[PDB]
């Protein structure tokens, strides 16, 4: 009877459509796992909503992502939330100049209705590797 | 039958308790607020656990503090757990010199057994004001 937990495996898909729809510049899909309180903190501490987050990282003529290497992870999964911890690599172009950047971020998934959202983020800078 | 939620008072209690055990260095009672798998990661992004937490932050033959003032701040408490979004001025003496810096702050709490801990913590600096 004992089977892979739905709730954890959502999670992981999540996780995995997430990247994909930020290599790609996927606004549409974005929005959609975006929790309708959502907020980004960037690595100088400034606040995005859902909307300006998805102009200033997820439209593709603005900005165009070559990679998010994920360096490093711990995912922990209460009742209703669920927290992640990650060193990331990014890897993008803006305005034909490219750039890199390393940062230790978190993020708290909110799970309700048989779903996940992404619902907060937050960047700390890294030194370059 | 309306009554205030001690859930929700009780956080209130425990962000008030940590202030007055980290202006006053009292190790003993901070360590009774931190989860078994608390970590804080500072604004260059080094991770800290309980013990070295406290050695860095809450021992005051190394660090006096005068004062963490808090300008702002955001609570949402979900079912087993809380996040508290907040922006802080530390003021501290770490030997002999004095120290000012401001930081966007996220934490989260842990409800369990009736009771919270601080079990995640991570800084993002801020220019100074």
Known sequence: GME??????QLQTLLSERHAYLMEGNREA???LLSSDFSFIDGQGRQFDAETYLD???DP????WS???????????FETTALVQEIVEDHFSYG???YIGRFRSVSLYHWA????????????????S
């Open 30 to 32: 974005m929005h959609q």
């Open 56 to 58: 200033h990282y997820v």
């Open 4 to 9: 892979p937990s739905a709730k954890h495996l």
């Open 61 to 64: 003529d603005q900005i165009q």
């Open 96 to 98: 034909r100049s490219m």
């Open 113 to 128: 209705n048989e779903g996940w959202k992404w619902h907060f983020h937050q960047l700390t800078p890294l030194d370059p």
């Open 67 to 77: 990679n998010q290497i994920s360096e490093s992870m711990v995912v922990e999964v």
